[PDB]
């Protein structure tokens, strides 16, 4: 589930707080922003880009 400490956005297990940096490994795409009530503008990290840049 998504959470913020107040400044940064994390994803965590539902039953024990373990904040992970949000990536396309933790998260699945669907549709576009318009349809979801209460969606938030944020950054998702892409683990492949530094590996291609290196």
């Amino acid at each position: 589930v998504f959470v913020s400490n107040g400044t940064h956005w994390f994803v965590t297990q539902r039953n024990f707080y373990e904040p992970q940096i949000i990536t396309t490994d933790n998260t699945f795409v669907s549709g576009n922003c318009d349809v979801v009530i209460g969606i938030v503008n944020n950054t998702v990290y892409d683990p492949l880009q530094p590996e291609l840049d290196s």
Binding site: R14, S30, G31, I37
Partner: protein, 49 residues
Amino acid sequence: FAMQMAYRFNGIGVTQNVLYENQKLIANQFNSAIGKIQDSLSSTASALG
């Protein structure tokens, strides 16, 4: 409550996007179905048999 129902869907193997991308429709189906409970219970004494 929308994030609870997204877990309720996840618990039947229906992925969470099937909830938020239909949220108003799911809310209206719940509200309409709740409306039919009043009419069902009000109309016949046989339901509490």
